[PDB]
Structures are given as C-alpha cells and as structure tokens.
Design a protein around this ligand. Structure first.
Ligand SMILES: Nc1ncnc2c1ncn2[C@@H]1O[C@H](COP(=O)(O)OP(=O)(O)NP(=O)(O)O)[C@@H](O)[C@H]1O
Ligand SMILES: [Mg+2]
Length: 340
C-alpha cells in the first residue's frame, strides 16, 4: 500500500565505460525484462518506478519518465527532476548538463534540452492560453551559490509567508525555444568542470536550471498559474583513492561529499516522516534549495544513475539504497493559483 504522492525514482544504468573495460571489470547489475527491478551483485533486488538498462537511449528515458512530469506544469504544478549518483555514473549526460549548440539534433541530447523542446511544443498547442517563461541557472560550488548566467554574493533568505528567495540571482525572460536553450548553453559554459581519474569532465558543483512558468487564459488575465520547474544536475560522490585528486580538486571533492551527506540525511529523515519529525534541510545550501522538491510542494522525479561495473559495487549499492529511500518521501504538490 502506497498512500499519497511519492517522489518517483528512475534507476538508470549506463553501459561500461573505457576506464572500467581497461581495469577488467565485469557487469554486476542484471535486469528483469519488462519489470522495474534491478538485481545487484547477482543477489540483492531493488524495485523503482522505472528501470533503464544500459541499452536505454536518451529519448526513451525522456518519453517514459520525464515527459509525463513536465506535462504537469501545464496544470499549474511545480516539478523537479534531479540526477543523483557516483562520479562518472551519467548525471550530466542524462540531464544535458554539458549540452552545447554543437549537440543540436544529436539523439544523444539529454533531459534539459528535451524539456525545452517539449514546453514550446505544448505552448503552441495551447492556443487559448498565454505564457510567460523566465530562466535562472545557478551552481553550488564549495558552499557558495554562483550565477551561471553572470559572465556580488548571492544569499538565501527565507520568506516567512512561504519559500526560499535566492537574493541577487539573475533571470532572463525567454520568448522561444532557441533563446531558452541559449541560456542552457551559456550556463553550461560557466559550470565549474575539471578532470579527475574517474571523470575527465567531472562536475565540481551542483547545478540547478529553473524555468519559471506563468500561464493564463487569454479571455481572463486576472487568474493565472505560477509555478517553477527545477532541473538539477548534482555533483557526485567521489573517493580520493579513485580520483587521485589533490589540492583544489580534492577540496572540491570534500565539499561535494559533505553536501551529498546532507542530502542523504534529508532523504533518510523524510522516509519515516511523521508529526513532530525534524528534517535537516538547513544543513546545506543544496538541501535548502531542494526543500520543496523533497517533501513539499512539487511533483519530483529522481534519476538515480549507476555504473554497472563490479569495481563500483559499493558506491552503486549506496545509490540504490538512497534511491529506494527517496521513494518513501511523500510530497504535497498543489495547483499554484494566483489572482491579481
Ligand atoms: N547512458 C550513457 N551512455 C553512454 N555513455 C554515458 C552514459 N552516461 C554517461 N556516459 C558517459 O560517461 C561519462 C561520464 O558521464 P557524466 O554524465 O559526465 O558523469 P557524472 O555522473 O555527471 N559525473 P560527475 O559530474 O563527476 O559527478 C561521460 O563521458 C558520458 O558521456
Ligand atoms: Mg557531472
């Protein structure tokens, strides 16, 4: 029995990568055809809302798991898609967190460029309605919020009558798909990325791409829906013994791991939520920004990314365990009406 509106979880297993083939890894994950199950270490089974094996292409991930969620923003809901998993697991790949214009029309494009396409397709169908879209794009780098659309210090202020405000963050008002994707491209070029042994293009920050959507009926300008879509490419857990990181790179890894610890503590707290519980959102900027997304006013999809390689079994088990806990989180999305 599942009561209410849980966080949904898609488990995505990428294929083996060159590093793993080089080191002689075997696959340690197996799948059960047509069932949303994965078997790990040929022994332990986990069930999710979706399971995508290594052959699953970007288009299928999007159409199966993401598109139905995005369509909910047109009913006036907030929604979040967040990718979570070890370094090198495929979060940025899945999300399109490194998309550039060079990738336009490549079937390898990920979630964010696909969301932008879909939003404008749906807007064009909804000829009886008018829309306002704005985008912001930030990263959380070594515990600071940096504006990725900014080629002063940004701070979180809690409004008493509902919600976080990110003071000093810029927004662009967009008109069509092309200028919306330009924002993604621009922010992606600013995202802090560096090499480690586990990923030559490791994300050194958590990135959040936000589209604010206002919808109103053309025959009635006073009433609207106003909601937000957050598209989140987290940084991933890493171990110095595998990354070989030193200096500033290792400091990034420490800050990343600490934040992900805070996220794990939030997920664990929410799994058994009840009256009088405490959930440690306040412990990190990341978990403050994800407060509505996890346990609050949002429809939320986690894309949990894993490597199939036996050398990563421990990390993969950690991701599977936390992704299993995330399914127990109950959200309370409402229709975000506004009247003027
Ligand atoms: N499903 C997939 N199919 C094929 N290649 C993949 C897939 N997922 C990831 N890759 C490749 O694996 C490498 C690492 O992916 P990436 O998405 O950068 O990892 P990440 O999870 O974002 N790591 P990090 O930012 O360090 O926490 C890249 O070269 C990707 O193109
Ligand atoms: Mg990444």
């Amino acid at each position: 029995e599942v009561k209410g509106i849980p966080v949904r979880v898609a488990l995505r297993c990428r294929p083996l990568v060159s590093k793993e083939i080089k080191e002689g890894c075997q696959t340690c994950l197996s799948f059960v055809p047509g069932e949303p199950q994965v078997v790990v270490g040929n022994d332990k089974s986990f069930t999710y809302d979706f399971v995508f094996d290594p052959s699953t292409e970007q288009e299928e991930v999007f159409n199966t798991a993401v598109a139905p969620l995005i369509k909910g923003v047109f009913k006036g809901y907030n929604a979040t898609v967040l990718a979570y998993g070890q370094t090198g697991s495929g979060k940025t790949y899945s999300m399109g967190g490194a998309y550039t214009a060079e990738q336009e029309h490549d079937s390898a494009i990920g979630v964010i460029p696909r969301v932008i396409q879909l939003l404008f397709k749906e807007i064009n169908k909804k000829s009886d309605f008018e829309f306002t879209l704005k985008v912001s794009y930030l990263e959380i780098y070594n515990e600071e919020i940096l504006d990725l659309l900014c080629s002063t210090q940004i701070n979180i202020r809690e409004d008493p009558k509902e919600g976080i405000k990110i003071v000093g963050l810029t927004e662009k008002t967009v008109l069509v798909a092309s200028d919306t994707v330009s924002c993604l491209e621009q922010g992606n070029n600013s995202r802090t990325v560096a090499s480690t042994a586990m990923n030559s293009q490791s994300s050194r920050s958590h990135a959040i791409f936000t589209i604010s959507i206002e919808q109103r009926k053309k025959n009635d300008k006073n009433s609207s829906f106003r909601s937000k879509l957050h598209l989140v490419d987290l940084a991933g857990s890493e171990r110095q013994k595998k990354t070989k990181a030193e200096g500033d790179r290792l400091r990034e890894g420490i800050n990343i791991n600490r934040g992900l610890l805070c996220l794990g503590n939030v997920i664990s707290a929410l799994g058994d939520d009840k009256k009088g519980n405490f959930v440690p959102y306040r412990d990190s900027k990341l978990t403050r920004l994800l407060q509505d997304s996890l346990g609050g006013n949002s429809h939320t999809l986690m894309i949990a990314c894993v490597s199939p390689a036996d050398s990563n079994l421990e990390e993969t088990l950690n991701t599977l365990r936390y992704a299993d806990r995330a399914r127990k989180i109950k959200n309370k999305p409402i229709i975000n009406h506004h009247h003027h």
